Amino acid sequence: GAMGSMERASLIQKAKLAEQAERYEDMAAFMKGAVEKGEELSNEERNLLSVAYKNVVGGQRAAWRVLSSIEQKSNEEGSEEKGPEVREYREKVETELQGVCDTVLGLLDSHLIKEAGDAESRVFYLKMKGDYYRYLAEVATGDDKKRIIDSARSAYQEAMDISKKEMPPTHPIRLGLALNFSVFHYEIANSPEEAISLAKTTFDEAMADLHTLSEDSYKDSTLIMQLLRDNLTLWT
């Protein structure tokens, strides 16, 4: 429950319908129910899971940033006191965002990561674990911020170690992991040099491997490769 009575295949079917309807919260709940059936997910199913939550949390993070900006301006010299509402509502959004991150991190811990033995699945789930801890780090301000940052780092690092050993440098999961770990270095860990080095090296190694790819692989590696280039252009 609430998805326990629905067939696994029906939850998958509805997640795809929710995707087409851009109903990402429904899509995420259907995929959570599918994961809770206890069977490993296929490649396509892992992509549905990650798309659903990426979109839900993406909307919450964008909202949190809007409210945090407002809050920060209300705290500047000469700003009129408007009471607690900005902080209260930023906190409301923050708590819901944290709850989604905790839900995803719990699915990964119970029991996606432990049953994931192939590199494609293991690296994928570890990247998600890195991403959701990174989203927790974006709003963390307390006693726990360092440990949250280290949790993101550790998950990304293990993903990077496996992806380097087991996946070609053009593999889209390897390229996306490196893109996000580079963003983690730049904006969470205060390590813009490391972020730039990682994006550069990633991009360069992928470029040198493109010759091995079919026209279709070439297209999808080059897409993530453009996001690496976008960041390098922004950061340098």
């Binding site: 991403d131 996306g176 893109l179 996000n180 963003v183 730049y186 904006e187 993530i224 996001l227 976008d230 960041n231 922004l234 950061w235």
Partner: peptide, 6 residues
Amino acid sequence: KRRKSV
């Protein structure tokens, strides 16, 4: 204008 992630 905002850095990319995926």
